[PDB]
Each structure stands twice: as C-alpha cells, then as structure tokens.
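ASSEMBLY PREDICTION REQUEST
Request ID: AP-0331
Submitted by: J.K., bench scientist
Number of chains: two
Total residues: 66
Priority: normal
Notes: Please return the full assembly, not individual chains.
Input sequences:
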Amino acid sequence: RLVREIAQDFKTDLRFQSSAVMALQEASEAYLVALFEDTNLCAIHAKRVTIMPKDIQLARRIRGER
DNA sequence: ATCGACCCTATACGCGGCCGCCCTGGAGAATCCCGGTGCCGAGGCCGCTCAATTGGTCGTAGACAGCTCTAGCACCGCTTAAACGCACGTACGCGC
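STATUS: Completed
Returned structure:
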C-alpha cells in the first residue's frame, strides 16, 4: 500500500505485478540492512552502542547520498 | 614577710607591602587593494577539404486495429500472529 501511494504521485491509474512489489521489497530491505550495518559502525566509532539519527546521516553523507 | 613598682618578654594588631587575579588599547604581522608593466595564450582571419547536404530508390520495422487470455484488483470472513500501550528499572548517553 505504501508503494501504491508513492506511485500515485508519479503517474495516475497504475497496476503492479505482484513480482514487482516483491522485488521492490527485496532491494529496500537489503538497502536498509546494509545501512544499519554502516550505522552501527558509526555509533561504535563514537564510543557509543546506541544508534542515533546523526549516525545514519553520517553514513549517507560518506556514501555521497545528499 | 608581704606588697608595690619596675623591667622584661610575649603577643596581638595594624597597617603596609607584595602577590595574584581580572578587565581593556595598541602593536604588529598577515591580508586585501591598487596602479604599473609585460607577455604569451586567446581570438581572428586565411585557405583548404572532407564531412554534411541533397536527391533518389528499396525494404522492413513499426504503427494500427483486432482478438484473447492471463492476472491484477476487489471483496469477504475467519483466525491469530503480530502490533500498541503501559510499567518498571537498569545500564548506557554525556557532561565534567
């Protein structure tokens, strides 16, 4: 349902193959798991154990995602 | 034998001197601007030629309509796995 909302803002009256949604979910979760790996490394580097929004922002800054 | 007076010493204070801490002017580099100079790369013109242009023919990918058949959407109900909220407290964030 979330992806349907995002697509409605791009083009109206769209249908999705069930395999298209599953592929979107696969790449999304893999991106988020990998991001939390980099996020956890940043938090440990700051002599901390708890992840914080500054850790994710630092990770995406190093990746070049602005 | 005892009391008063005098001298000596210890102590307290009194203020003076010295030190440490807290607030402003000014000195000196390092930077920006500026007018003179000067030089070498930019911008321009010259002329050559090869790539763009043009006119033309042949063919096929593609536009288009027609038909069909998968699968994407809608709906619904039952179960329950999972999600939400609240309570507690301990160990982790962070400030020193």
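REVIEWER COMMENTS: Residues 15-18, 48-50, 52 of chain A lie near DNA strand B (CB under 10 Å from a C1').
SIGN-OFF: pending second reviewer
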